[PDB]
């Protein structure tokens, strides 16, 4: 309770380079100094809750879920909350599209 203010939630648990599989559904997770609204970004892109884009929050905890992954999608995702933002390189793998043997 001091003069002035502090500001938005300062990313305390910045993202972490995660590696997913092609075709699968990637799921990121981060932490904020305090429950606050954020906006994920997939390489000079804007990620918002809609068709597949999932931005569920659990008290100072954001999680981006992108269905239908793709080796191309891989790059670098960032989470903007206000003044600060964290980025984490996402690595996509190639799913085994090989026909089982009998």
Swiss-Prot record:
Domain Ig-like span(s) in chain numbering: 8-91
Transmembrane segments: none
Cystine pairs: 30-79
Compartments where located: Cytoplasm, Myofibril, Sarcomere, M line; Cytoplasm, Myofibril, Sarcomere, Z line; Cell membrane, Sarcolemma; Nucleus
The record's account of how the chain is modified after translation: Autophosphorylated by protein kinase domains 1 and 2.
Subunit structure: Interacts (via protein kinase domain 2) with CDH2 and (via protein kinase domain 1) with ATP1B1. Isoform 3 interacts with TTN/titin and calmodulin. Isoform 3 interacts with ANK1 isoform Mu17/ank1.5.
Disease field: Rhabdomyolysis 1: An autosomal recessive disorder characterized by severe and recurrent rhabdomyolysis, usually with onset in the teenage years. Some of the episodes may be triggered by exercise or heat; others occur spontaneously. Rhabdomyolysis is the rapid breakdown of damaged or injured skeletal myofibres and may require intensive care management. Muscle breakdown results in release of myofibrillar content into the extracellular space and circulation, resulting in hyperCKemia (hyperCK) and myoglobinuria.
Function in brief: Structural component of striated muscles which plays a role in myofibrillogenesis. Probably involved in the assembly of myosin into sarcomeric A bands in striated muscle. Has serine/threonine protein kinase activity and phosphorylates N-cadherin CDH2 and sodium/potassium-transporting ATPase subunit ATP1B1.
Protein family: Belongs to the protein kinase superfamily. CAMK Ser/Thr protein kinase family.
Protein name as catalogued: Obscurin
Source organism: Homo sapiens
Gene behind this protein: OBSCN
């Amino acid at each position: 309770g001091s003069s002035g203010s502090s500001g938005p939630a300062h990313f305390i648990g910045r993202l972490r380079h995660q590696e997913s599989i092609e075709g699968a559904t990637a799921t990121l997770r981060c932490e904020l100094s305090k429950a606050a609204p954020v906006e994920w970004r997939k390489g000079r892109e804007s990620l918002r809750d809609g068709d597949r884009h999932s931005l569920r929050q659990d008290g100072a905890v954001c999680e981006l879920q992108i269905c239908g992954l793709a080796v191309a999608d891989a790059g670098e995702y960032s989470c903007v909350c206000g003044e600060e933002r964290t980025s984490a390189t996402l690595t996509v793998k190639a799913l085994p599209s090989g026909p089982s043997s009998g």
